[PDB]
Amino acid sequence: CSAPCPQDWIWHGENCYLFSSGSFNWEKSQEKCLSLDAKLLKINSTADLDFIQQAISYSSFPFWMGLSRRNPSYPWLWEDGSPLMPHLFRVRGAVSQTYPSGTCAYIQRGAVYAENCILAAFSICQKKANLR
Amino acid sequence: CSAPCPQDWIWHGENCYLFSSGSFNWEKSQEKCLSLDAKLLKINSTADLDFIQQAISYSSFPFWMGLSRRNPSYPWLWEDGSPLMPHLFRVRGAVSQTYPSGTCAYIQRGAVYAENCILAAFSICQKKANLR
Amino acid sequence: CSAPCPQDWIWHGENCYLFSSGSFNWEKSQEKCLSLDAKLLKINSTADLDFIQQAISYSSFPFWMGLSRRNPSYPWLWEDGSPLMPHLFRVRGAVSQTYPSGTCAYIQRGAVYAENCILAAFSICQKKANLR
Amino acid sequence: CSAPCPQDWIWHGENCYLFSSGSFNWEKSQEKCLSLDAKLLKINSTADLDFIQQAISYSSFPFWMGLSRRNPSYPWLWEDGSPLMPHLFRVRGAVSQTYPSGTCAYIQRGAVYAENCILAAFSICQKKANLR
Ligand SMILES: CCCN1C(=O)c2ccc(Cl)cc2Nc2ncccc21
Ligand SMILES: CCCN1C(=O)c2ccc(Cl)cc2Nc2ncccc21
């Protein structure tokens, strides 16, 4: 009857994941996921990080995730307005830099970094799987 | 109910697709897919080709597919002996040479290349999706 | 017989150019440049603007330039008191807000942005080269 | 009477460096430096590596250097044929993969990696300074 995830997505755990086939800025990447009733990558657990790390281990490219902020004294937040759970990962790089478009997190070679949201990167959309 | 593909595979059309965890000559890549109840990638259409190109678009690795021949005087055949549909893609690369283990094709950055089957590469495995 | 520019600077045209070492506010950045017998960047021509754009093309950071104003009713002026030539660039960003310490301009990704001079950024310093 | 380095280059120590203004594949990047009587970045000392790490500390982008090999059966060699100096840096990433157009080294966030030479990346050209 109901398939857990659409074709071309990857079903893992409670979620479905879609890896982009090209690089786009964080805003365009966000809009792609919204149009598919999804959101940008939200890592909720170490299991989620390990899965993503394995999936992107084929790649040296950067992948946008749904974590951002505009002010470096204020918390990183996922698009849904929740914070980065402690003990998942450290955002490396120039975490204190502000940019006109804000600061956004990306994963590259398994490590998470801060960067100018205006840069074009691959991205990963995530939605809940249709489980029972 | 019955999900079309196991977790961590890509469901596309009537099949499920998986990237190999490691890099191996073509024979060992063939044994690995068979031991997972699958076979090496078989491209039956340009839509298959487009899907695969998109799926590997974030990787620069070569991926073995199930296409091979013993030397240029034999036709290109898939693992199950069926023919290469000639107009789907041109096999570039080492198409004049003869190797002790034969010639095999991999996909890299959208294009298909002939290469010595003894060379190590990643691969893509494929099995039937569980539909209706 | 003597060198146009010190080591680690970039000689272009009749001047020498240097990236700041740290990301600070416009005030402090103007001071560090004065330390080096230099001033903040003054863009005097499209040729100057094109050189800077190429010089920062491998950076996503913003770089303070020597352009600033007290409010949207006071004109954009370089440090030497001279005005911004309109054809060089339109200033984007916060061109209608009013900050205590004024509005300052930085260049990023080829474009120029107004921003509170309190906020921290890298900067480009400029001084005259020793011509023939 | 002559300048150490041409305009738009960075003079450092005994050498001149030219950062690319865009991202290009390794063959194009190499062709660029050759057209300037130069070569791609050759790191022959810890001092060179340290200097390059600070010059690219403004950037999260990848920069091609002049170190390459056709496949793992060939040795890692600089463009001039000299070997990778022992104990200077490790080439990280997938050093044992075989690409159609060879494997090239790049620096990113101070670390050196192997990648498919067909990718587009920034680059750095290097030439002897014309000095005393
Ligand atoms: C969003 C950018 C993706 N990307 C890299 O991140 C990248 C990574 C490494 C190298 Cl050497 C060169 C690179 N340039 C590049 N070229 C073609 C396709 C992808 C890339
Ligand atoms: C050759 C690739 C250069 N590059 C990055 O390396 C890069 C680095 C990080 C992120 Cl998040 C996204 C990136 N994409 C990107 N977009 C525009 C200009 C440059 C880049």
From Swiss-Prot, chains A, B, C, D:
Changing R69N: Does not affect subcellular location but displays a strongly reduced affinity for acetylated LDL (AcLDL). Residues 1-132 are extracellular. Changing C117S: Abolishes sorting into the cell surface and binding to acetylated LDL (AcLDL) while increasing N-glycosylation. Induction: By inflammatory cytokines such as TNF, IFNG/IFN-gamma, IL6/interleukin-6 and by pathological conditions such as hyperlipidemia, hypertension and diabetes mellitus. Up-regulated in atherosclerotic lesions, by oxLDL, reactive oxygen species and fluid shear stress, suggesting that it may participate in amplification of oxLDL-induced vascular dysfunction. Signal peptide: none annotated. It is found in: Cell membrane; Membrane raft; Secreted. Changing C1S: Abolishes homodimerization. Residues 12-126 form the C-type lectin domain. Receptor that mediates the recognition, internalization and degradation of oxidatively modified low density lipoprotein (oxLDL) by vascular endothelial cells. OxLDL is a marker of atherosclerosis that induces vascular endothelial cell activation and dysfunction, resulting in pro-inflammatory responses, pro-oxidative conditions and apoptosis. This is Oxidized low-density lipoprotein receptor 1.
